[PDB]
Amino acid sequence: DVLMTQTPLSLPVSLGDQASISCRSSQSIVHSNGNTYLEWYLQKPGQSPKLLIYKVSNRFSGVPDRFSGSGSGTDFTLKISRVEAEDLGVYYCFQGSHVPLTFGAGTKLELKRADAAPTVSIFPPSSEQLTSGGASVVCFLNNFYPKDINVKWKIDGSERQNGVLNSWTDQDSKDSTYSMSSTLTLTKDEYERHNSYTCEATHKTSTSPIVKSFNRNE
Amino acid sequence: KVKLQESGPELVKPGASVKMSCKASGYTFTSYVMHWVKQKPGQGLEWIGYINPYNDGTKYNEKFKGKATLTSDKSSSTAYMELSSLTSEDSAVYYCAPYGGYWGQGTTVTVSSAKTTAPSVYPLAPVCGTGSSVTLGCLVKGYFPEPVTLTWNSGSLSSGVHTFPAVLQSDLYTLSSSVTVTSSTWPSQSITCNVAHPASSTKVDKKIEPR
Numbered sequence: 001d002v003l004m005t006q007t008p009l010s011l012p013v014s015l016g017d018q019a020s021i022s023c024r025s026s027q028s029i030v031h032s033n034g035n036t037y038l039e040w041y042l043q044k045p046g047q048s049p050k051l052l053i054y055k056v057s058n059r060f061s062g063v064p065d066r067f068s069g070s071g072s073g074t075d076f077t078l079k080i081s082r083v084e085a086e087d088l089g090v091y092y093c094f095q096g097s098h099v100p101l102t103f104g105a106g107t108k109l110e111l112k113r114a115d116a117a118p119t120v121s122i123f124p125p126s127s128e129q130l131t132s133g134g135a136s137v138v139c140f141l142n143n144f145y146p147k148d149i150n151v152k153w154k155i156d157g158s159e160r161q162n163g164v165l166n167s168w169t170d171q172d173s174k175d176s177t178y179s180m181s182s183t184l185t186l187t188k189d190e191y192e193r194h195n196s197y198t199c200e201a202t203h204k205t206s207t208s209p210i211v212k213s214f215n216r217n218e
Numbered sequence: 219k220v221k222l223q224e225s226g227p228e229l230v231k232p233g234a235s236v237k238m239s240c241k242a243s244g245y246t247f248t249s250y251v252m253h254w255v256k257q258k259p260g261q262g263l264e265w266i267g268y269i270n271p272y273n274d275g276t277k278y279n280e281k282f283k284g285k286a287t288l289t290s291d292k293s294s295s296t297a298y299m300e301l302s303s304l305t306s307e308d309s310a311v312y313y314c315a316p317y318g319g320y321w322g323q324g325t326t327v328t329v330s331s332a333k334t335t336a337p338s339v340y341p342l343a344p345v346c347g348t349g350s351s352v353t354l355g356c357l358v359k360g361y362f363p364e365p366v367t368l369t370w371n372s373g374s375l376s377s378g379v380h381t382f383p384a385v386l387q388s389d390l391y392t393l394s395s396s397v398t399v400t401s402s403t404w405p406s407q408s409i410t411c412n413v414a415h416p417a418s419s420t421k422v423d424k425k426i427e428p429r
């Protein structure tokens with residue numbers, strides 16, 4: 001199995017900059033017939049992949065020439081001379097020379113902007129849900145950059161992961177930041193056997209966790 | 219032009235089977251094999267294998283032998299793929315493609331045992347206490363199937379909003395939304411959550427009250 005490793009797995013750029021994506025095959029992808037079936041795809045949310053480059057360096061019909069591909073044998077590279085907005089999305093390299101055919105893991109080309117810490121908000125269970133016997137504690141981590149982040153819950157000091165459901169938004173269309181919601185669901189019974197609920201967020205904009213918290217009986 | 223028509227979305231039960239179609243037009247069906255690609259939501263791409271319409275020859279990725287079965291019909295220029303013994307692992311979007319330049323629109327397969335269930339909607343007010351900006355939330359829990367459409371004040375208040383992708387709970391979904399406004403605006407004014415679940419023809423409105 002020819003595995004295709006592409007680097008990086010995430011690539012922040014500013015409109016107008018140059019963009020280079022690497023893809024290396026764990027082995028030669030020269031097909032028995034003499035051709036090298038290395039392709040590059042760009043896929044946008046809710047769409048199917050669109051071919052950009054085939055046979056290493058050939059542009060497909062309708063593809064802008066600021067896209068060029070190169071490399072040989074085991075090392076391949078895709079370059080975007082100057083990034084436009086229609087270029088944002090996930091890129092994939094693919095090899096169709098040896099079965100099973102394989103794709104690279106994908107490289108998301110996103111936008112660069114200034115680092116920004118997350119605005120952390122915590123929400124106790126609503127009276128309604130509590131009347132219904134359930135108890136969800138919500139914690140929003142909004143408007144941060146870059147995208148990597150980690151949330152940690154502590155109930156009466158105890159670290160908790162069982163019952164935590166996370167969701168992440170795509171890069172914002174207006175300010176280029178990322179957000180995240182973390183929700184801890186317990187039963188009302190369980191919820192009432194405890195007092196302090198805490199959500200800590202560690203983000204690269206600080207070595208110190210941003211911690212939000214509340215005491216149930218307040 | 220080359221066109222690849224794939225069958226509509228499939229909502230099927232675990233353990234059963236499903237067979238999707240890929241109808242080709244615009245070129246000579248037997249002049250190319252027909253590849254199938256699997257993509258699990260928010261993740262990578264996987265080559266399932268291919269069928270050569272001309273001689274019905276096939277080649278499968280060892281990972282999909284027995285799980286997928288590729289067939290083709292020359293009389294109607296239509297290729298088919300059958301997935302047996304479904305599991306939630308088979309939920310994903312399947313594509314067919316004669317070659318790199320032309321892919322079908324894909325067929326979404328959702329493997330689940332759930333029944334249509336309207337969502338529970340709870341308002342999320344801040345903890346009793348103030349700064350100059352307030353963040354309010356709305357949490358929609360345990361609905362099925364997807365999707366639901368959420369708005370704030372019917373769509374008027376659309377700035378400073380973050381609606382997160384839904385995620386599976388049991389075999390039910392759960393999603394949330396947060397909107398941040400200046401405290402000069404809330405609770406002096408009004409702010410209500412509008413959740414519409416087209417599958418159960420329900421549209422709930424829950425407004426955020428101070429605690």
Ligand SMILES: CCCCC[C@H]1O[C@@H](O)C[C@@H]1n1cnc(C[C@H](NC(C)=O)C(=O)O)c1
Nearest residue numbers: 033037095096097251253255315316317318
């Ligand atoms: C999802 C689209 C994948 C397209 C894969 C084909 O495009 C090129 O990379 C070549 C690759 N391909 C791989 N096998 C084939 C068909 C095969 N041809 C060769 C030269 O092995 C045959 O005729 O059986 C085509």
